[PDB]
Each structure stands twice: as C-alpha cells, then as structure tokens.
Amino acid sequence: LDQLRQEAEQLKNQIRDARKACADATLSQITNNIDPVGRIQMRTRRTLRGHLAKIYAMHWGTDSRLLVSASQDGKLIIWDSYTTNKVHAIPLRSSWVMTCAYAPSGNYVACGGLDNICSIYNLKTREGNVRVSRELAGHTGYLSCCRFLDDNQIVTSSGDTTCALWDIETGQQTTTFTGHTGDVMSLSLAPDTRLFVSGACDASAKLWDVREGMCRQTFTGHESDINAICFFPNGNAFATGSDDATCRLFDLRADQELMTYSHDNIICGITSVSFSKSGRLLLAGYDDFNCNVWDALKADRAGVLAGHDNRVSCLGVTDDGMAVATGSWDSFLKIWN
Amino acid sequence: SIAQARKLVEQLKMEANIDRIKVSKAAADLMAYCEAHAKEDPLLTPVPASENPFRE
Amino acid sequence: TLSAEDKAAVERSKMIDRNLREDGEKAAREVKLLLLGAGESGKSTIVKQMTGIVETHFTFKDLHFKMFDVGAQRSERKKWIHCFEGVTAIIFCVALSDYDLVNRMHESMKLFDSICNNKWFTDTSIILFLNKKDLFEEKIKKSPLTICYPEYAGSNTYEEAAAYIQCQFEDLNKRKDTKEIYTHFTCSTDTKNVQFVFDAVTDVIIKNNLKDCGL
Amino acid sequence: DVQLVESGGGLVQPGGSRKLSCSASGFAFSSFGMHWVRQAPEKGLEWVAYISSGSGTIYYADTVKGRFTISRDDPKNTLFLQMTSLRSEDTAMYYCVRSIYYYGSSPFDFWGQGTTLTVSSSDIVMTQATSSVPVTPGESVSISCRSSKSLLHSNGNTYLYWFLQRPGQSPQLLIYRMSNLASGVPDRFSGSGSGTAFTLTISRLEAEDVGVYYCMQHLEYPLTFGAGTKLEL
Amino acid sequence: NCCVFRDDFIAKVLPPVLGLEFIFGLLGNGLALWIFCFHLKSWKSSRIFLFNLAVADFLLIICLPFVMDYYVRRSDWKFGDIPCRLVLFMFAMNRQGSIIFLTVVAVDRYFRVVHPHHALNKISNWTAAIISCLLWGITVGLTVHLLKKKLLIQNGTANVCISFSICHTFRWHEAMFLLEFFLPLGIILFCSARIIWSLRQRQMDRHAKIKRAITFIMVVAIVFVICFLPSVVVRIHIFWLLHTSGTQNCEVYRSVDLAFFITLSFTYMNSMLDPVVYYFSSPS
Ligand SMILES: CCCCC[C@H](O)CC(=O)O
Numbered sequence A: 001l002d003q004l005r006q007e008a009e010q011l012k013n014q015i016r017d018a019r020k021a022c023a024d025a026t027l028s029q030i031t032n033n034i035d036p037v038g039r040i041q042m043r044t045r046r047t048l049r050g051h052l053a054k055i056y057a058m059h060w061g062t063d064s065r066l067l068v069s070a071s072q073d074g075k076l077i078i079w080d081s082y083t084t085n086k087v088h089a090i091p092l093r094s095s096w097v098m099t100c101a102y103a104p105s106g107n108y109v110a111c112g113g114l115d116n117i118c119s120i121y122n123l124k125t126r127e128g129n130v131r132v133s134r135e136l137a138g139h140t141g142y143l144s145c146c147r148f149l150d151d152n153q154i155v156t157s158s159g160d161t162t163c164a165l166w167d168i169e170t171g172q173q174t175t176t177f178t179g180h181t182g183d184v185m186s187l188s189l190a191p192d193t194r195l196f197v198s199g200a201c202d203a204s205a206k207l208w209d210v211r212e213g214m215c216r217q218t219f220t221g222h223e224s225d226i227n228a229i230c231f232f233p234n235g236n237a238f239a240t241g242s243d244d245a246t247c248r249l250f251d252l253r254a255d256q257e258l259m260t261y262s263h264d265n266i267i268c269g270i271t272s273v274s275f276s277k278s279g280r281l282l283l284a285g286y287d288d289f290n291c292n293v294w295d296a297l298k299a300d301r302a303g304v305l306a307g308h309d310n311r312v313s314c315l316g317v318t319d320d321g322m323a324v325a326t327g328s329w330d331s332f333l334k335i336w337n
Numbered sequence B: 001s002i003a004q005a006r007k008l009v010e011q012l013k014m015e016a017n018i019d020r021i022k023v024s025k026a027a028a029d030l031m032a033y034c035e036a037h038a039k040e041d042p043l044l045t046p047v048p049a050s051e052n053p054f055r056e
Numbered sequence C: 001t002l003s004a005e006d007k008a009a010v011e012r013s014k015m016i017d018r019n020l021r022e023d024g025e026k027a028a029r030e031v032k033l034l035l036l037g038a039g040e041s042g043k044s045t046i047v048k049q050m051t052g053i054v055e056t057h058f059t060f061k062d063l064h065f066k067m068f069d070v071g072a073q074r075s076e077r078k079k080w081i082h083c084f085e086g087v088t089a090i091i092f093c094v095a096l097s098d099y100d101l102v103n104r105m106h107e108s109m110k111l112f113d114s115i116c117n118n119k120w121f122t123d124t125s126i127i128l129f130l131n132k133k134d135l136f137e138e139k140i141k142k143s144p145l146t147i148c149y150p151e152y153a154g155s156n157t158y159e160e161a162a163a164y165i166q167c168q169f170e171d172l173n174k175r176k177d178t179k180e181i182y183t184h185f186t187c188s189t190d191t192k193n194v195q196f197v198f199d200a201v202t203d204v205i206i207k208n209n210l211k212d213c214g215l
Numbered sequence D: 001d002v003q004l005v006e007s008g009g010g011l012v013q014p015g016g017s018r019k020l021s022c023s024a025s026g027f028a029f030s031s032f033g034m035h036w037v038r039q040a041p042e043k044g045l046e047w048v049a050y051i052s053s054g055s056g057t058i059y060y061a062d063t064v065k066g067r068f069t070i071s072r073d074d075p076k077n078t079l080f081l082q083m084t085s086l087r088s089e090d091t092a093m094y095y096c097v098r099s100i101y102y103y104g105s106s107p108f109d110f111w112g113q114g115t116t117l118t119v120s121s122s123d124i125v126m127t128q129a130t131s132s133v134p135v136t137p138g139e140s141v142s143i144s145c146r147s148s149k150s151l152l153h154s155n156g157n158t159y160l161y162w163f164l165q166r167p168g169q170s171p172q173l174l175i176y177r178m179s180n181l182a183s184g185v186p187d188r189f190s191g192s193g194s195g196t197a198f199t200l201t202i203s204r205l206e207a208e209d210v211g212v213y214y215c216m217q218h219l220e221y222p223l224t225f226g227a228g229t230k231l232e233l
Numbered sequence E: 001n002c003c004v005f006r007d008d009f010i011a012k013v014l015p016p017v018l019g020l021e022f023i024f025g026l027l028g029n030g031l032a033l034w035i036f037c038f039h040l041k042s043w044k045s046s047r048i049f050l051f052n053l054a055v056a057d058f059l060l061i062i063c064l065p066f067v068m069d070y071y072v073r074r075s076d077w078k079f080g081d082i083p084c085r086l087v088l089f090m091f092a093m094n095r096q097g098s099i100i101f102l103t104v105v106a107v108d109r110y111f112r113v114v115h116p117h118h119a120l121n122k123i124s125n126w127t128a129a130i131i132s133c134l135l136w137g138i139t140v141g142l143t144v145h146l147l148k149k150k151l152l153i154q155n156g157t158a159n160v161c162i163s164f165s166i167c168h169t170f171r172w173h174e175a176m177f178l179l180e181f182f183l184p185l186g187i188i189l190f191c192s193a194r195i196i197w198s199l200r201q202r203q204m205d206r207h208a209k210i211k212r213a214i215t216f217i218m219v220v221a222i223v224f225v226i227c228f229l230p231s232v233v234v235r236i237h238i239f240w241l242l243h244t245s246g247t248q249n250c251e252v253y254r255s256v257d258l259a260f261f262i263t264l265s266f267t268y269m270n271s272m273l274d275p276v277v278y279y280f281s282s283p284s
Helices: A007-022 A027-031 B002-015 B023-036 C004-027 C043-049 C104-116 C135-142 C165-170 C192-213 E015-037 E045-063 E068-073 E081-114 E125-142 E172-198 E214-245 E258-267 E273-279
Strands: A044-048 A055-060 A066-071 A075-080 A085-091 A097-102 A108-113 A117-122 A131-137 A143-148 A154-158 A162-165 A175-178 A184-189 A195-200 A204-209 A215-219 A226-231 A237-242 A247-251 A256-261 A270-275 A281-286 A291-295 A300-304 A312-317 A324-328 A332-336 C031-037 C053-060 C063-070 C089-093 C125-128 C181-183 D003-007 D017-025 D033-039 D045-051 D058-060 D068-073 D078-084 D093-099 D132-134 D141-146 D160-165 D172-176 D189-194 D197-202 D212-217 D229-232
Touching: A007 B002, A027 A256, A027 B023, A055 A312, A055 A324, A055 A332, A066 A097, A075 A108, A075 C004, A085 C004, A097 A143, A108 A143, A117 A143, A117 A154, A154 A184, A162 A184, A195 A226, A204 A226, A215 B002, A226 A270, A237 A270, A247 B023, A256 B023, A281 A312, C031 C043, C031 C192, C043 C063, C043 C089, C043 C192, C063 C192, C089 C104, C089 C192, C104 C165, C125 C165, C125 C192, C165 C181, C192 E045, C192 E081, D003 D093, D017 D093, D033 D068, D033 D078, D045 D068, D045 D078, D058 D068, D141 D160, D141 D212, D160 D189, D172 D189, D197 D212, E015 E045, E015 E068, E015 E258, E015 E273, E045 E081, E045 E125, E045 E273, E081 E125, E081 E172, E081 E214, E172 E214, E214 E258, E214 E273
Parallel strands: A055 A097, A143 A184, A184 A226, A270 A312, C031 C063, C031 C089, C089 C125, C125 C181, D132 D229
Antiparallel strands: A044 A332, A055 A066, A066 A075, A075 A085, A097 A108, A108 A117, A117 A131, A143 A154, A154 A162, A162 A175, A184 A195, A195 A204, A204 A215, A226 A237, A237 A247, A247 A256, A270 A281, A281 A291, A291 A300, A312 A324, A324 A332, C053 C063, D003 D017, D017 D078, D033 D045, D033 D093, D045 D058, D068 D078, D141 D197, D160 D172, D160 D212, D189 D197, D212 D229
C-alpha cells in the first residue's frame, strides 16, 4: 500500500520522457517560411440590442443565419442576423443562466446555470409557442456548458467536477465522466462527435471518448483556471484560454503543447476562444473590453476588435465563416465582418 | 485512500501506452490543412461586397 | 421595399420589443438582496422572519424584496460571485453564541473580510445581523470571553462583551469612503428586522439616486 | 388539438346585415394573424379580409372595403366579421384561417370548417389552364400554375402556395414558398418551377388524393387564387 | 407714448459688461456642449434636463455679440426690424428657458431625495425628451406675441429697439416679468428646504454626501436670488412711482432708469456661472 505517491510519480516521469523524446522541432521553426497574414480590418455590420443585463452565452445556428443569446435578465432571445429581427423570446424560470446551446437540426435549444438543471426547450410546436420539452437534473453544481449531439443526447459540464452525457427521451444520465479535481468551465465537441475535450479549474484539459466513457489523454501547462476551449477544424488539435493572459495550442496525436499566444501588454484573462473556418485565425475575447485576432501559426497579433464598453463574455463564428458574433457584459452583441 | 490511489495508477498506466508521432509531422499536417482550405475563408481575405450577406 | 411576409416579421419583432421593455420596467423596481453567512448561523431564522440558488420574495410597505440564498453552492466562489454585482445590499448573518466553538468566529471573520473587501462589492452595502443575543447572556455567564480574542480586557457582561464584537467586525472594512455597514442585534419574535432592512435599503436607494442624477 | 369552429351563417335578405364568429381552441390565438377567405358555391376560393396579431394592420379585398369590418377578441379567443349591405354576390362559404409570420414559418397551415351564407335575390392574376385531368392510382401527375408578374422578391424567396381541397372538406396546406413541405404531408408531393411558371408533382398517386388544387400568391397583399385543377378517377 | 429714457443716456454705458458676458458665456456653453455631445455616454433624465439649459445658454451666447454695440451707438439702432425682432425674441427665450429648466432641475432633485421610491425617478429618455419638447413649446408660446409686429418708437426717428419701455400702463409683458420670478423662486426655495431637512433629519448628514450636496443646492438657490432679484424690484419701484405720482411730468425718472439696464446686466450674468454651478458639480 506504500506504492502511492511513488508509482504515480515514476509513471509521470516516464510520460514526460516520452513527450520530450517525441519533440524534435517547434511549430514556429517550421512555419517561419510562411507568408504573414497581414493586417486584418474587421468592422461591425449589425448591432443586436434588446437585452437589459450582462450577456453570458451565445451560439450560432447551423444555417449561419439564426443565433441564440442568454443574459441575466431571465430571457433567451433568438435573433435573425441578416435583418436583426427577433424570432423568439423565451422567459426562463431561473434568471441565473451561464450557458446556452442551439441544436444542430434547429428544433430545440438548451439552457442552464446556477440552478444545477439543464432545460431543453422545443421551438417547433403546433400550439405556436415555445414549451419546456425537458428538465434534466442530477448535477450537484452550477452548469457551465452544454452541447447537443444530434437531437436526443446532450453533454453537460458543471462545478460538480464531472461531465455527463444524457438521454433526453428518458431524462437519465447515460454516462458520467469523472477525473477533474476542480470545476469544469467549458467543453468542445469533435466534428465527428465521438470525442470531446473539457477544460477545468485545476489548470488541466482532458480528452474523453463519448462511447467508452473513460478519459483518453490529459494536457497541462497553464498556470491558472482554463475557462475557454475549442477544437481545431481538422479535429486533431485544440486551443485553450486561461486566466493567466495566455492562449495555448495542444495537439492530440503528439500529446504535446504546440505554441503559446501571449503578449507583454496583456495581463487580463481570456473569456472565450474560437477558430476561423480555415483554422488560420484564432479569435480570443479578453477582460479588457477587447477581442484579439491571432495568426495561429506564428503567434503574431493581427487585428483587434474594439467597440465593446465592458467585458467580452461570449464569442462565436458561423459555419460558413462569414461573420463573427461577440456578446459582451454591456448587453450588446456585434456581428463583425 | 487506497481506492483513489489505485484508480490514479490505473489511469496513468492507461495514458502511458498511446503511440505518439513526432511534432514535426503534426506541424506539417496543421500547415497542410491551413494551406489547402485557404480560398474558403471569408475572414482571411475581404470578400467583395456583392456576395456579402451582411452588406448593410 | 419589403415583401408582404417580411413586413409582418418586423411587426412581430416590435411586439416582442414592447413586451421586453415592459418586463424590464417591472423588474427594475424590485429590491434585490444577497444573503450570506457562515452556515447554521441564523439564516433560516432570518428567512422565517420575512440544490442551488434559493429565492424568497416578500412585500413590505408596497416594496418588493427578492432575497437570494446560496447554501448548496459548495464550489469555487470566485467563478460565480460576479453574478451578484448589481445587488442592493448583502445581508450577513453571524452567530454571537459561536465564540466558544469547542473557533467558528474566526471563520466568520475571515468570510466577512473576504466578502467586504471583494473587487466586485466596492460600493455595495453590508447589513450585519448578529443573532443569538439571548444565548449570549448564559454563555458569557458560564464561560468567559477571554477564550476568543485573547487581547480583550474588560468586564464579562452584555455591555462590554457585546458592542465589542461589532467593532471587531467593522474594523475589517477597508473602504470606509464608499460603503456603509449597518449593524443590528436580532430581536425575538418582532418585526424590527424588516424595518431595519427597509431603512438601510431606503438609504442605499437615496444614495444611488443622487449618484444617478449627477449630484 | 387545434380547432377553429365558425358560426353565424344563414338566410339573409338583400341589403341586410350579419355577423360571423370564429372560435379558436388549442393554440396561442394571441400570436396568430387571422384571415377570412370566401368560396362561392361552385367557384374557387377568394380572399376576403385579414387582421394582424395585436391588431395594427387590417386589409380588405377591394370589393368589401367600406362594407365589411374584421376584429378580434384575444381574451376570449374569438374572431369577428361584421358584414353590412349584403348583396346577391356574397352567397358563399366562409373559412377562418390562421397564419403566423417569422423567419421560416408556415402561414395558412390550418383552415377552419366553414359557415354557409345564402343571401337571397396591381392584382396579380394566376392562371391554371386546365380544368380536369383523369388519373390512375400508381401513376404520376403534374399541375402547372402561371403568374403575370414574377413572384421572386430580392430576398430570394418565391412566394407561391399550393393548397388541396378534398371532396366535402376544408382546404389544407400542401406546399409553402414553392419548395417547402407542410408538416404531415407525405413525401410523394413535390413542388418546383421558376418565376412566372410553377409546377406541383405527385408521384405514385393513390386514393384520398382526388380533389381540387389551388395555387396562391403572397407577394402583394391583395392575395389571389387560381381557378383550380380537379383530379378525377 | 413714453418718456423713453434708455436714451439721453449718460456715459453710464457699460458695453464692456455685456461683452464680457459675451465671451465667458460663449466659452462655458461651448465647453459643456463639447463634453455633452461627444465625451458623454450616460443619457439620463437629469443629463437631458441639464442639456436643455446648455442649449438655452448657447442661444444666449449667439444672441450676445450684437448687443453692447447699441449702447455705444448711444441713441440709434443701425439694423432694421428683422434684427430687432430676432434679438428680442432670443433674449426672451433665453431668460424663460433658463428659468423653466432651473425649476425643472430643482424639482427633479427634490423628487429623487424626498421620494426615492417614486416611479418618477425612473423614466426613460423618451419621456424626458417629450417633456423637454413640451416645455420648449410652452416657453415659445409664452412670448409669441412679441414677434407679431415691430413696436419701434418714433422718438429716435426709427432707430430705437427698446422692450419693456411701455413705462405707462400695465402691458402684457409685466405679468410674465413678475410671475416667472415669483413662482419659480417659491418652488426652488421649497424644494431646497425639503431636501436640506430630509437629508439630515434621517441622520444622513455624515459620510460627506450631504456636505457635498447641501452646499451646492444652497449656492444654486442663491445664484437664482443673486440674478433675477434687482430687475423685479426696479419694476415694482417704477410701477409704484407711476401709480403714485401719475402719468404727468415723467421727466424725472431718467436718474433711476439706467439702473434698470444694470439689472438687465445682472439678469444676463446668469450665463457665465451657470455652467460652473451645474456641470462642474458632476464628478463623473
Ligand atoms: C444692449 C444690449 C441688448 C439690447 C436689447 C435689449 O436691451 C435686450 C432686452 O431688453 O432684454
């Protein structure tokens, strides 16, 4: 029974040695022979107003035209981007929401927050209104993220320090993923929806297999809480944003860090991270009211999206990659192009 | 107690067996994907206003 | 230049906007309080006088109060404490009889120091609600106050032992230029607690109005 | 379930007055625009009047203006049509239709039942150059509708609707905006065509499909129907 | 016919005063506007009510330049009837607008302090804009009758542009001269008294909130008293002299008629320190 604190250290050292052996070059060394992106001039096209409190979440539809936003005023608003019209305004039982999602088929939406319950709302009903299709309970902490799989399974993460894959038809936890030692702040779904990564407050990220139900790999390197995560469009890498004013790129196959995006004049944490359609750009929302655009091959800042009067809380990019939506704490969403 | 320690040891053993490719190969793959899908990114290069849905 | 079907979507959006404005106007006139404590310190009693979040709604003198209680949130406070940034006041409950603790008084002091000097509550008032004033007499007649605060030197009566914990709690305040701590000793089977909360809320609202007008 | 029940029809002397009522149960009546649609005893359909949701938009069909008045009572979920100075050219059956307008919605989805009136004794035109076409169960049939002004707005939406009326039943929605299929309609129905020329195709025809097919436009608000194509045998 | 004595004017002429008012007022109203229009984002009801006073000060500033000149001229008025009507209407507007919006600001503060839970304290910018437009219409309609014609006397041929010089008989302008000082004063004093009483009676005078608030309200009230007092008292004095001595003689009043012009110099001084006592008050 004395093997504790000694066997694990030796296996960790073996893993470190393997990672060091597999490292021969860096992304910068290979990429230094690539033409720089250059200055990126993105400007606002539509300003979506109507929320009366801080906006905490936002998600794009799969048709790249409709989006959903959630704020602390207990409202879930569905916007039509092209004409800035309001399609639906769902009132919430609990006005402490911290996340929202849009179903891939466009039939349902999901919400959750400090009430530890994930609510599923049905948008296409014969009665002509929006009804609460389901209320999933079982988490012991505030929900922080939720993502639909197809139309009947949803993945959620909470401050309980566990993740859960549900089954909306019966409302039961089909699978539970454990292993984090701190609150789980976000998750991202792989394009093939067979794996997903989760970033926790113990300065770690973990890659879970949805079908098997067990952790595959663990990634470390940050010095503080991770509160944003996103997959590369390829599906073999991801990016993390933390509270130490640093973004990082991790790779699944090499099981190693690739490059860190940081600057001397940035000292505030990152709230949201997203990629572009081609994966060349990397957009990160910051606490100093701004949103930076990084050339995610040389770690060179290549643009700034200024125009918000408070902290930028949510960030998203359409599937066709023709616009970027940023929602901030001043109750405003902006569509940059 | 013993249970958590043995679970951690088993998980570390499971994670200490996956094959790892070299970093140079991964860098080449990322660069290849970024270069191949270069003309399909409206954000990288300003699309002309004629086919801009957000004209506005 | 809009089609017939496109001109009705605009009307629907305008109706949605009007309903949203009405809801916001209705909601902005409600007082919001955040209830905090060290656990089993009298919070249940205070709620009686008037999973996750627990909301209690009540009415006093045609004024609507919503009080938010966090008891099941046994997680990182710093990840969700910024949600309650616009609350009118923080009602802090402390037990006067927990000075012996077989200890918990120091934990309560640490919690009060962390909450009062937070970067989000720079200008949010705290209403102190020292409870259990009845058991204090017996507990101070049996055991002395010297067990807690060893630097204390005074009579063991309910005139020096009390009104000394209040200064100990108030001295933890560092921003004595934009906040104000209202301290009250909870009564027994009386409505004076709601009156005290009402007076503190009125003062906070007057100050907020004077800030808003620009004076 | 959704239900619209109409009442207030009967024999009327010429020049008199009448009131028709439509009671709605099973859906959010307050958020639906409502239409009154006529049909002469042996003729095709004809739009009559329209009232919006949260009444702020009212339209009449250029022949009842100044004689008919449309109103709604949301708390009791009722729709009223007051008709004055009735003449012999008003003997018809009246239908109470609902329609909700937002991005991706399906207007005209549910039709009422009908009340019979028996009064004693710029305008796009849609052409259906076909009256009757014999069919057999198992084959495929096509119905063609033709417009005078192109029904293609700059948005990219073509505003054409295809309705079916079975023998002795209220019409039901088949196709909206020239390409989309209404909920509950079997896959064998399809719709296509370009501006000024549209087609509806039925593959593997079977029973309970014989009836009259109507094409409607929704570009400019004096909505117009087609003559109607009847399938027999 | 009056003994028009804004002529036979002694070198009492003080164009310098009217002109320094010119400079300073322009300056202040402009400074405020620059900050109000560009370096400001909080659009609240009090901000709108102060912006209305700012535009009144701007109108007074654009009316100031072509003014002191006339007095230097001595007895003549070089321009025609249109400039006379324009300058007179601008002066009347400036005074009435300043008075009305000062009273509105005082009432706003009174409601925000004494009745903090009233629904009035929370009104959207739209209602504030409607109220401002209604007040502007009211003040425009108060003195509409002064623009219908041109009452230019024949004493100085036709080069006399002098309002109020009705001297004999009570005209329709004296009522606006007296009521527009009596009622707003009373409202200002009542609101100030209630604000001072209710902000100290509740044991709130400490924390330096009242110390930064009571004094300013007091100085605003005093500024109201320090400007619009003398003109009223000279009007009452001349009215009493007319009623007692009668309409005869009348060639004795010139010794105490230029004092009225001085008073106007007082009444137009309420433009330079108005931005200081109001817009400097906000520390945000
Ligand atoms: C002497 C400067 C302005 C001349 C016009 C009048 O004196 C203005 C007035 O009567 O209020």
